[PDB]
């Protein structure tokens, strides 16, 4: 009895899954591409680990995340595959519960990790207090589309401290600070939305995962986690926290997935 895990997000979540590629099955839970391909980590990412390593029962992964995505190109634009377009792909192929993904309220989990690229492209040009609610409201409206389809179990990840990626550190401490302060307001508004949605609906099971505090703990004490420092880059994905100047490697993603497992038990697959 599988859990259907539909995910939405950006390069921290992409695996290159195609809706016309091989579809998830018990023998092939990611569908496509092979587990460990298509990511920004040198191997599996958090979704691959949650699906195949941390799972307590069969999890089938339909991963619609796309590189560089923002929430909606009508707000902060970037690439064609914004979160809105990912939700449209879901509506076009999976929302109506086809034989290849015959999901129900009791066995579908919708995971969303989004907002980093919106912050990264708006943190110096917009007022966080009045602009981040517009981003969060659009996210909520997209979540409502899945609710109307019958989705009831939701996983939201807050934005991690990308302010401390090598890419941002190179821009100076005051830019790190400006970006971090904006990011904090987004994450507060995300938590508020998730709380309000949960209470207003009354029939949903939700998890807000604080990726920000977890990664911050590792960046603040990297050697406790087997990393030599908090800034080095290594594309092996394991020798350093960072796989390139902006994206963490498979070791970080595994540590995060292991941290998430206990917090995901109420969602059915862990």
């Amino acid at each position: 009895n599988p859990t259907y895990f539909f995910t939405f997000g950006d390069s921290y979540s992409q695996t290159g899954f195609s809706a016309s590629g091989t579809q998830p099955s018990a023998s092939n839970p990611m569908g496509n591409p092979d587990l460990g391909i298509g990511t920004t980590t040198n191997g599996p990412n958090w979704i691959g680990y949650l699906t195949t390593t941390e799972n307590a029962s069969l999890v089938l992964s339909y991963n619609l995340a796309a590189g560089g995505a923002t929430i909606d190109n009508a707000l902060v634009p970037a690439y064609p595959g914004d979160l809105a377009s990912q939700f449209r792909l879901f509506e076009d192929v999976y929302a109506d519960k086809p034989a290849s993904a015959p999901w129900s309220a009791e066995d579908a989990v919708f995971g969303v990790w989004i907002g980093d690229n919106d912050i990264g492209n708006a943190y110096y040009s917009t007022d966080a207090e009045t602009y981040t609610p517009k981003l969060i409201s659009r996210l909520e409206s997209l979540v409502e589309e899945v609710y109307k389809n019958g989705g009831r179990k939701f996983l939201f990840l807050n934005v991690p401290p990308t302010s401390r990626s090598p890419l941002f550190l190179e821009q100076g401490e005051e830019v790190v600070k400006q970006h971090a302060e904006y990011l904090s307001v987004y994450n507060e508004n995300l938590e508020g939305m998730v709380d309000d949605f949960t209470k207003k609906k009354g029939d949903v099971t939700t998890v807000l995962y604080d990726s920000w505090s977890f990664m911050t703990k590792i960046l603040d004490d990297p050697t406790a986690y087997g990393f030599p420092d908090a800034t080095c880059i290594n594309d092996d994905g394991t020798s350093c926290i960072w796989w390139d100047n902006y994206h963490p490697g498979m070791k970080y993603h595994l540590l995060q997935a292991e941290d998430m497992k206990p917090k995901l038990r109420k969602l059915g697959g862990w």
Side-chain angles (χ1 to χ4, degrees):
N1 286 264
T3 292
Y4 300 91
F5 187 27
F6 296 99
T7 48
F8 306 82
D10 59 29
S11 308
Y12 272 48
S13 295
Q14 71 177 64
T15 57
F17 175 88
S18 171
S20 277
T22 303
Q23 292 298 287
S25 69
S27 68
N28 177 8
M30 302 296 298
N32 70 91
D34 292 345
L35 171 72
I37 297 303
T39 66
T40 53
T41 73
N42 202 43
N45 70 2
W46 69 281
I47 298 167
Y49 288 125
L50 284 184
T51 299
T52 72
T53 305
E54 309 307 307
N55 60 303
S57 49
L58 177 59
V59 176
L60 299 177
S61 167
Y62 304 77
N63 181 24
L64 308 187
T70 54
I71 291 161
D72 190 319
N73 289 320
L75 294 172
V76 180
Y79 291 100
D82 59 358
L83 197 77
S85 78
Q86 300 173 30
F87 272 79
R88 175 60 168 170
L89 174 57
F90 174 81
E91 276 322 294
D92 289 338
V93 179
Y94 301 110
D96 290 338
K97 303 160 177 187
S100 68
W103 66 270
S104 73
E106 310 95 86
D107 58 30
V109 173
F110 299 87
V112 178
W113 201 4
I114 201 70
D116 182 45
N117 296 311
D118 311 72
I119 294 158
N121 288 288
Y123 72 92
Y124 61 92
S125 58
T126 62
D127 172 64
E129 159 189 50
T130 56
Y131 193 74
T132 65
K134 296 178 197 130
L135 294 170
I136 293 300
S137 176
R138 180 58 186 136
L139 171 53
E140 196 274 347
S141 294
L142 288 170
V143 168
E144 177 58 35
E145 296 185 16
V146 161
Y147 187 89
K148 283 206 179 62
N149 299 318
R152 290 300 180 271
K153 308 204 276 194
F154 299 86
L155 164 63
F156 298 90
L157 289 75
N158 74 3
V159 182
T162 53
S163 324
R164 298 171 64 182
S165 63
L167 187 161
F168 268 98
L169 296 175
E170 187 278 329
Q171 293 176 58
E173 287 173 47
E174 91 282 10
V175 166
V176 169
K177 170 182 164 73
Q178 203 187 13
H179 180 278
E181 288 189 353
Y182 191 105
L183 184 153
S184 75
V185 177
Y186 179 86
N187 277 352
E188 286 176 319
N189 285 334
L190 174 67
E191 170 163 56
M193 187 260 311
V194 172
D195 287 347
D196 294 347
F197 173 80
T198 303
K199 287 166 198 168
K200 178 192 32 102
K201 294 311 201 186
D203 64 349
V204 298
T205 303
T206 63
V207 169
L208 176 65
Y209 177 68
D210 184 4
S211 82
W212 190 94
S213 295
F214 179 73
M215 184 186 277
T216 290
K217 183 159 55 153
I218 302 184
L219 296 174
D220 286 349
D221 190 6
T223 66
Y225 299 86
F227 298 111
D229 59 49
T231 60
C232 72
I233 298 164
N234 194 317
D235 69 359
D236 68 6
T238 62
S239 291
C240 294
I241 297 175
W242 306 102
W243 170 79
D244 74 357
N245 68 0
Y246 196 69
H247 306 90
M250 48 181 284
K251 179 169 171 186
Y252 170 78
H253 279 256
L254 173 58
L255 285 169
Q256 186 184 292
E258 285 173 345
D259 190 62
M260 294 173 79
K261 178 177 170 68
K263 299 145 169 36
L264 300 195
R265 301 190 95 104
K266 58 191 266 184
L267 297 174
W270 298 279

